Recover the amino acids of this structure.
């Protein structure tokens, strides 16, 4: 039972060489909890993994199976990507984002992580006279910083907490007006906070990207997952909001991993502004041997990175997008379950002494979705994560996300089974009773 | 069908339309586009020998395992950070049973084909000694995409054509570069794309010894694994085994693709089998850009994870099952792909009966194996002139001009896709070409 012995916890941390639990890597945190579950015979409420909790859509799976039987495993995918995937991604951009993006400029990638890597690789080499590459609108996804670091590309970042709405203009522009940046990246909906960039904010970002001639990489990993609206019906409003409505300098990264529960197949698509795709950048020639942005990215960089994405997986994604386009599959009907879980879980935290840290978009309360953030009496997250583990819960801090809200933890709603909800509530009660 | 030779005006028009100035230097896309536009414009089918891609079906063991795993749920689960355990374990067993080398599962890293394996090997290996001016020394002729990878990474490289430096002559030639102290790595394919030459034991000992002496990492591209059909490397756990530099140095990365030996190119799956000692070796110069000190951790936990967060889960299962079946003696990979050698023997004879000579013709004193590729020349004619002659006679192949070869008379012939039903067409066309002379 709870709380778990303090000595046992120290011992298991020492075994893993963990000095500050708030900075432990995800694999070390997972190993710690797994070791504690075994040592104590308890099952933790594990809320730390931002991964799919739903099965892959049958349309995807069955298409891969059919295509493997037809012979695609022995055939290299086309240099520019599977034509069907490029075409359905183009249709998807129109039917779900209302953006006109040609199939030519829709590029299959090995997940949005390869999509981000190549975007940084090319976008941050567009202007050799600029000292920096990406401006990060954090809290964000730390692997993206590692990508830039691996590329040797300097970057800057700021925590969006104090700069929402019209306040975003002066803050973004403080960096862009140095003339030293090439790109901007953010996720919407956001990992880790679940904030959704408003149309006011997207207009500010787009206007400034055009003014300062920088490229916006918009990470739509949690596609259409702001459940306060319904973005799931093709060809009619509402549509997923996008910076593409406010600038021509954009790359829209679409992953299959979250909205299509397809993380294992490593397949995504970059939907690149058509005008950007054709734009001639002399500074790309030395390293890529292409002048046009899109050719440098797709024909040179991606080809060199992996010579395409898994052929069966390209078909799986094409089939899933087509089904959405055609009105035969509603992607939101399954993933909205995460929001239903969030509504329940948020209330358990708030009933037991917690507050939502990143709590609003404009005046709208935070959506119920895949993640939310919590704090407990402003205590440092390094202390709160220890308190979680003592009470058989696991979640991550925001310490490596660029957030300056040192009290914040990220709660994920995906894997925790509803059958463990009674245990989560009891544990939160016990945690709050200790105080 | 219309008849040969094709009219020179027609060929000029279609080339001009594609903006091809020197056909011997045209990219593979433009060459392919030219031939398809000529086929369509003339009602003929060319004998297309230019594409170095599998011509056999993917093995059922791979396909069926992917199918089962997709049904079981792998599509919704990110692959483990270090790779699918089963693939790591089966690759380790494969190194032991087919190369006779002990490489732990920990150091066997799944990649999105060998092209991702090569990219990440350059990315990391060429950052191991910041005080060295160059990255890779290419033992060419080779795979031009590798040079583009170094170019993209901003890493200088050097290259030489192995033709004049075989056997003991390789030592002085390789050492002329390495003794400058400015290189980090060496790469070659064995069997080789484009020449089908296979590095001899004598040459592998030289490369390994020099790699140890000058502290450089050898990247051995085993894309055509076990495909020297002059020997039989297909029986697990008994000699002969696939020759490898791993017998002669601890500084090695073995790149194993599924694309050719397992006709699995579409699924973008391979494995780097990294020397265990190398995997654990600490390199201070990797920390700044990778945030790891050990070579293996910089490559797998940092670099590959940033590159794509793994390889397709079902594909990792497919390759694991194929390696396992080889390891367990249930599948023989050579029994399928030896078909390429059967075709090579026939095709070589057609070229040689019609005035050609084999350019890269021997490994030591042994005639070149019958396999996936071979090189031909025609009266020492420049390959930009010979490729024009091929096209006029309804044949397509590539020159060696973008491979690092200085044998400017050579063309690469691939035996993979050309259907046997077209063998008589190839023969007729070679007769006609030779008669013109
Ligand atoms: Cl970082
Ligand atoms: Cl190049
Ligand atoms: Na809609
Ligand atoms: Na053997």
């Amino acid at each position: 039972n709870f709380p778990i012995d303090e000595k046992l916890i120290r011992e298991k941390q020492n075994e893993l060489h963990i000095k500050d639990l708030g900075m432990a890597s995800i694999r070390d945190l997972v190993a710690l909890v797994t070791n504690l579950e075994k040592a104590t015979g308890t099952k933790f409420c594990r809320m730390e993994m931002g991964v799919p909790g739903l099965p892959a859509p049958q349309i995807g799976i069955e298409t891969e199976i059919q295509k493997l039987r037809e012979g695609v495993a022995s055939i290299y995918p086309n240099l520019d990507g599977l034509p069907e995937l490029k075409q359905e991604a183009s249709r998807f951009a129109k039917l779900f984002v209302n953006i006109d993006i040609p199939a030519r400029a829709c590029v299959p990638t090995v997940g949005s992580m390869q999509g981000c890597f190549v975007s940084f690789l090319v976008a941050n080499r567009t202007h050799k006279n600029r000292e920096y590459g990406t401006l990060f609108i954090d809290p964000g996804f730390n692997l993206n910083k590692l990508q830039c670091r691996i590329l040797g590309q300097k970057f800057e970042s700021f925590d969006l907490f104090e700069y929402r709405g019209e306040k975003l203009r002066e803050k973004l522009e403080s960096y862009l007006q140095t003339g030293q940046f090439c790109s901007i990246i953010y996720s919407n909906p956001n990992n880790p906070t679940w904030q959704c960039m408003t149309d006011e904010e997207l207009r500010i970002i787009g206007e400034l990207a055009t003014k300062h001639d920088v490229i916006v990489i918009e990470d739509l990993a949690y596609f259409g997952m702001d459940f306060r609206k319904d973005y799931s019906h093709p060809g009619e409003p509402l549509y997923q909001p996008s910076v593409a409505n406010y600038t021509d300098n954009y790359i829209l990264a679409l992953s299959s991993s979250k909205a299509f529960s397809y993380a294992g197949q490593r397949i995504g698509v970059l939907m690149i502004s058509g005008k950007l795709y054709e734009r001639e950048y002399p500074d790309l020639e030395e390293s890529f041997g292409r002048l046009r942005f899109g050719e440098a990215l797709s024909s040179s960089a991606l080809y060199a990175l992996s010579s395409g994405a898994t052929h069966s997986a390209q078909w799986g994604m094409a089939a899933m997008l087509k089904a959405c386009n055609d009105g035969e599959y509603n992607f939101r009907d399954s993933v909205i379950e995460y929001g239903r879980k969030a509504r329940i879980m948020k209330k358990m935290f708030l009933d037991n002494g917690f507050n939502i840290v990143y709590d609003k978009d404009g005046n709208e309360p935070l959506a119920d979705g895949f993640y939310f953030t919590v704090g407990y009496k402003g205590m440092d997250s390094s202390k709160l994560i220890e308190k979680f583990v003592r009470y058989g819960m696991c979640a991550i801090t925001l310490k490596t996300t660029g957030s300056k809200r040192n009290e914040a933890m990220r709660i994920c709603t995906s894997l925790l089974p509803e059958s463990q909800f009674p245990d989560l509530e009891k544990r939160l009660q016990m945690l709050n009773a200790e105080g």
Q: What stands out?
A: Residues 104-310 of chain B form a domain with the Aspartate Aminotransferase; domain 2 fold (CATH 3.40.640.10). Chain B touches chain A through 57 residues (CB under 8 Å). Chain B has 15 helices and 15 strands.
